Amino acid sequence: RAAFKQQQTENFKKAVVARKAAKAGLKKTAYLRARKYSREYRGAEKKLVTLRRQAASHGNYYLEAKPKVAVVTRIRGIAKVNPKQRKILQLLRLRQIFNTVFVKMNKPMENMLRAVEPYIAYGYPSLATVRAMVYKRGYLKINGQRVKITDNQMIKDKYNNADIVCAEDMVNQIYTCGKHFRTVTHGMWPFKLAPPAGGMRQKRRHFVEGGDYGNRDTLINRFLARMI
Amino acid sequence: VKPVVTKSVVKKRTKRFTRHRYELFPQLSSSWRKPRGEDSPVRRRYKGQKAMPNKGYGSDRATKYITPSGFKSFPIQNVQDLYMLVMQNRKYAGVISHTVGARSRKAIVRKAHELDVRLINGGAKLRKL
Amino acid sequence: SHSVDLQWILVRQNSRFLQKRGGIRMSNDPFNNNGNWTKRHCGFLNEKAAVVKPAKGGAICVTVKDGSSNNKPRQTYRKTVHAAGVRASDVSRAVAAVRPDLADVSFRRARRMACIASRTAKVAAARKARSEKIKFSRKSVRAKRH
Amino acid sequence: QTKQTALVRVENVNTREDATWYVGKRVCYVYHGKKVKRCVRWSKAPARRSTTRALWGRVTRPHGNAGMMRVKFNGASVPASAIGRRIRVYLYPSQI
Amino acid sequence: GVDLTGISKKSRVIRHHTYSTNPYIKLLIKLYKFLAKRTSSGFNKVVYQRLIKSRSNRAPISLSRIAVVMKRKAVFTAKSKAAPIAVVVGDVLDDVRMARIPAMRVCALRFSKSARQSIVAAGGECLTFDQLAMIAPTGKNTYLLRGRKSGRESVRHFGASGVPGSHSKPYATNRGKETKRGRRTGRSYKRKAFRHV
Amino acid sequence: AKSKNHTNHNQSSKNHRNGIKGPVPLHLHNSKRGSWLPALVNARRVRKHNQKAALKKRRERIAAFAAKN
Amino acid sequence: KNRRLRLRLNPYVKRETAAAKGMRNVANRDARRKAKMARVTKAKKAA
Amino acid sequence: PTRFKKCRHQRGSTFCGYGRVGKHRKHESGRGNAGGMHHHRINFDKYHPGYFGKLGMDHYHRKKNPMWKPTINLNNLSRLIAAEEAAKATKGGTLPVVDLQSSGYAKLLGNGHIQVPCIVKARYVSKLADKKIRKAGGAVVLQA
RNA sequence: UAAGCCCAAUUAGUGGUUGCCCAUUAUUCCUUUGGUAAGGGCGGAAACAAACGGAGAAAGUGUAGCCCUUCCGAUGUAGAUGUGGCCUGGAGGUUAGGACGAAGCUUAUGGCGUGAGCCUAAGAUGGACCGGCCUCUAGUGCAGAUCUUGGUUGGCGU
RNA sequence: UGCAAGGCCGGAAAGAAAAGAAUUAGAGGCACCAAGUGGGCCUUCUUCGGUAAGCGGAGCAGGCGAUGCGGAAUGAACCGC
RNA sequence: UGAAAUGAGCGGAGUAUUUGAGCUGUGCACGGCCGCACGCACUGGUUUCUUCUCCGUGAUGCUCCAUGUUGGCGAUGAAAUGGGGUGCCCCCACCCGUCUUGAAACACGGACCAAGGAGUCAAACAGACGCGCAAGGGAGGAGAUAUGGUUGCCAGUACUUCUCUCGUACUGAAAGGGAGAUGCAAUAUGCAUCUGUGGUGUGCACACGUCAUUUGCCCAACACC
């Protein structure tokens, strides 16, 4: 009936197939990416184990190397914060109590983290935390809005890079550092977490004391998984 | 003419806002005024002082301005004003004005009962036939 | 030549037909279908318009504007009565010939007038049925004139 | 005090593990009025007509560390005239 | 509370609406607010940006400014393809200082009576914004111009007069009044005529 | 009454509230009026001859265009 | 923790969950331990 | 329109925007221009340099009439010519006479490629204004 | 046999791994309001009388917001500004009301708005004026000045 | 045809590798008009006069002033926020 | 309460490849070329254990609203929800305005009410914003008639000029002087031409390209001349 209705409702007709074809075609990649990575991870921890176990029994040792990513969360509130510890907590995107970020661990970021330590409980993430934090608390920053990740399509949208497609590419550069670690995090909205379920018992002291703040190494995972 | 139903009618706060310390003084009207007192407790929010009006008390904007009957109230001074709300009568209802008469008030009650538009202060006996 | 676009900026906030009461904006225009105050519903203002308006028993008139006799008023508004039992899509399809914008409302209003007339018929019957019992001490009749 | 959630010490329930058994049960507060008002089976079973009344609730979760269990009286709160008086914890809804 | 120093200092003022009571301007923005939205063209949403600016920010260009400018573009265009339109969202005025203007098809909100005759008498057109939507709905092959805003006597008074290296016109009704100290070098001192920054 | 107080207290908090604006770029203001003059003269004596040569190129690119087409 | 998302973000999750449930069965888990303990110790005694 | 005034938004503020500590009062600084050399010195030496002192020789009884020279530019001789005179003009041909003392101007300055050649009747002329007309095919016939 | 001091733990060499209570905090859900706000729809798709699935859809800063989905913020003295923001006496318009009862007045008279306020109900009040809306206009909003004037009042049958 | 300067015309441009080898709720920049304030006080650390002071005077910062709310029975400023 | 149930979950039909077990070959890794390899990387062998796999519905719905089951009460006087009043209980809670670093203060004003009660009017200047006109803009005072009329509505509206005034030009104490571009060219007023940005760097939109960006012109504007 409507002259342009067909010139419309036929265009909608093939844009629907374009969606469905460009959807189920993404699972194939999202599937063969995850596969590639899961096998990639067991091919590492099982390499260290064989490699560690050789340095033992011959009287050698094995360096764990140096962790690269570090999860950082802010244990104090906003009050009575000095000028240089504002400007650092802002450049780390931690603007709020119990925000969290993933950052490289290198000399400029190491020396930057120790000036704010009274504010910061940080450490070295598991793979279980990154998955949990990129899935459950993951929010992409799209056009200025903080939007939850309900889908693998929107990730491929924001990042046109096509080394980041599914949520399992997200976790990868987060976990393994790598090339796109910045442009993946920098597009994540900084994590917002609940308080720890059972608690620290003294936010005001360093962890190596009856304290929270500072570098608690891998015990951050155990501490962080209470926030999620 | 059963009204257009909305979602839940919940009000944020029913109790009114009255100005600080009007009960003590008989000339002070219960109407609100914002205290500008520098050491005034109410301005400083002391927990157990009266609460102030905010942007935060809005009425939900879905159920906003709806009387308990389900009808947004439109005033009517004469039998010709019934015709505007003939079509939307599921939404609006009429309110005869105060000064409108025992004689005009006879007319509007008829020509409302015929059209099925609803009057609030219109005689309700024709409805409870 | 004074387009509707330009005239709606003039009459929007002031009018005879505006009638904003208690924060509500209705319209007392006789040519409004549902009575909201908007361009599509301003009959006096638009260059082509239509209305679903009642007549005797259940007949449904339709008044209709048009571009051409736009000035010259007894000639710019033309009414045509549809028969008593008219379908509502019949009346709407008339209005949709002139102004397809109104195809929905004229339908809902066509069915509406049909509801009113058959509502007046039940009421005016029940009022007089029980008006017999009342003994009135006065009544008035305007005497036929030649 | 936040007057939404009551606190109930139910007799012979002395530990927390003993409270989680009661999550969901329906508490009652059986006070009385002065004049006799309307009642649930009124005029069906007129022998219930009387001055006594009840407020009902549910047990929302264990409060404390020993046998102490919070309560929600549905849509309202209990009077503060009920404090230190008899609350009734029934055995239903049964989870068994 | 979340920490956002400010947050009142990245925010800036925009004002989508118009401060003009003119009923016709309110039609022109009606057109471009529509067709700067759906048009996918740079030109067409600049004129919507510009159409809401209050008179002070829309400065009339004289004629002979359009002519000189458009004679600079007309040299390097291909001789085959010529269709520039002077499109101005301000007023266009008449320059007594220049005669013999070519035919430019200028578009504007308002023309000086002597400026419009001085166009058509030399063979050009004058076409207002309800036309140009028909001729250049994409703004294609238009030429967009602004005004000259920096010669106003208000911009001349801005800044303090007695600051070193500030040439600025002070507020006085009697010009012979303030010449005599801090201006003349002879008595107290002369404000330095130039200052490095 | 002792009115002679002096403090720096709140200042660098105010000075950074609109921030300390960084310097103006080198290219923005040169304006060499200082300046060592016999070099300044010999700079304008060239800067004139660069105008002729550059305004001539304006003409040679008028012909060469209309020459092309 | 929601079954419907996690698969949309990681379609491979089910293989991963099935591989993990392949450990938790008691028959396979200790027969896993029997072989590891023999595999490793024999490797030690080779150096 | 007193309903738009700032006073009408300030009912209830009690201080009308003049401040709680330093109050509004009457005259804080002295009345008017008072304080030029003293406690306003920064203002009058910043925004108004030159307000103080004496300058120049002294002219009693200044009557503005004997000194009257509105001038004009060669660039601006168009608007003293009606249309159809400016249409027909050429160097050596017949060209319209423009009178100044009847047109409210006196001196004829420089500043322009004279647009329309003319013979201009002017009380006062300048050097470079002379050349251009004389060169562009007009003339200057001076009057009084 | 601490309900004291030092140290330490979490239901205790029994399997590691969060005892419990309380914030205007954190996380999340609903509702409001403001954006440097982000995006979508707005060419009426078609069909369709009563009687015995309805109703809207405005090219738009602001309203009872054109509709919808989304995201972030939200406290504040002095101070600045905004409001299609409330009230008052009048003038230009427009639309109404009123001896079947106007202004005024009184009320455990309710209804609407975050609020200024509006509106209806009743008067066993009143006795002749008056409301809405656009615009104009000003002697235009009271609790405090040892404020002005009139009245009254506890102290006191002292 | 060295050096100074203004250009012009070509060259290349991990657009900044590797080495721990940056990060950002990073729109930069300019302008007009104008209010209030110009009595402050408290604290970690540094600090001068004084026997000392809930005394007087400063430095870098954070607060109260202007702001409550949860906590130290109570307290402007402490603790958490 | 299905008024678009997008579901491993709902429907349809079928029996899939992730891990763990043993091992392949080159490689890595370990020990002092061989031996090792705890089983890493590459091809990717075994099926003994382990697990479900696959494909299906756009809106022709732009918006809002409208669809269960079981009992109690509700049969025109009542029932029910909301609002209101008075008392009570548990809890929370210093007296207002003000000067003040600091007020609940043993700091000052304060018995109650009604009616009054405080940023106004005028002029000069400026900057925002609305309007007209634009190298021109605008009067002021007065005159002229419809009106030489009308109780009034009219003290208004309509009409008008040479002039006046703020502008188009500025500078010097003053006498005085007084502004374009290009080419040729160096003449103590050089000469010619007149469709034109004085030049350079940065710079909307547009135009022809390219994988945001090359070049053209660059409006406004900033800077150097």
CSV table of N, CA, C and O in Angstrom, one decimal, chain H residues 7 16 46 51 62 73 77 104 110 113 121 133:
chain,number,residue,atom,x,y,z
H,7,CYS,N,15.4,43.2,43.5
H,7,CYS,CA,14.7,43.3,44.7
H,7,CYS,C,13.5,42.3,44.9
H,7,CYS,O,13.2,41.9,46.0
H,16,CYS,N,19.4,41.2,51.1
H,16,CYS,CA,19.3,41.7,49.7
H,16,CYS,C,20.7,41.7,49.0
H,16,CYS,O,21.0,42.5,48.2
H,46,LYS,N,44.7,53.1,36.6
H,46,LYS,CA,44.6,51.9,35.8
H,46,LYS,C,43.6,52.1,34.7
H,46,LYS,O,44.0,52.0,33.5
H,51,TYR,N,43.9,61.5,34.0
H,51,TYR,CA,42.8,62.3,34.5
H,51,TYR,C,43.3,63.6,35.2
H,51,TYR,O,42.6,64.5,35.4
H,62,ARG,N,35.7,79.7,23.0
H,62,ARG,CA,35.9,78.8,21.8
H,62,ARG,C,34.6,78.7,21.2
H,62,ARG,O,33.6,78.2,21.7
H,73,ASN,N,36.2,61.4,2.1
H,73,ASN,CA,37.2,60.7,1.4
H,73,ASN,C,36.8,60.6,-0.1
H,73,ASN,O,35.7,60.5,-0.4
H,77,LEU,N,33.1,59.3,-2.3
H,77,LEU,CA,32.3,60.1,-3.2
H,77,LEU,C,31.5,59.1,-4.1
H,77,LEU,O,32.0,58.6,-5.1
H,104,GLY,N,27.3,69.7,3.1
H,104,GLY,CA,27.6,69.6,4.5
H,104,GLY,C,29.0,69.2,4.9
H,104,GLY,O,29.3,68.8,6.0
H,110,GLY,N,42.2,62.0,1.1
H,110,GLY,CA,42.6,60.9,0.3
H,110,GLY,C,41.9,59.6,0.6
H,110,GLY,O,40.7,59.7,0.8
H,113,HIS,N,41.0,55.0,-4.4
H,113,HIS,CA,40.7,54.9,-5.8
H,113,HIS,C,39.4,55.6,-6.1
H,113,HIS,O,38.4,55.0,-6.4
H,121,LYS,N,33.4,70.3,-5.9
H,121,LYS,CA,33.6,71.7,-5.4
H,121,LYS,C,33.8,71.7,-3.9
H,121,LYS,O,32.9,71.3,-3.1
H,133,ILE,N,42.2,62.6,-7.9
H,133,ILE,CA,41.1,63.1,-8.8
H,133,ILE,C,41.7,63.7,-10.1
H,133,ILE,O,41.4,63.2,-11.2
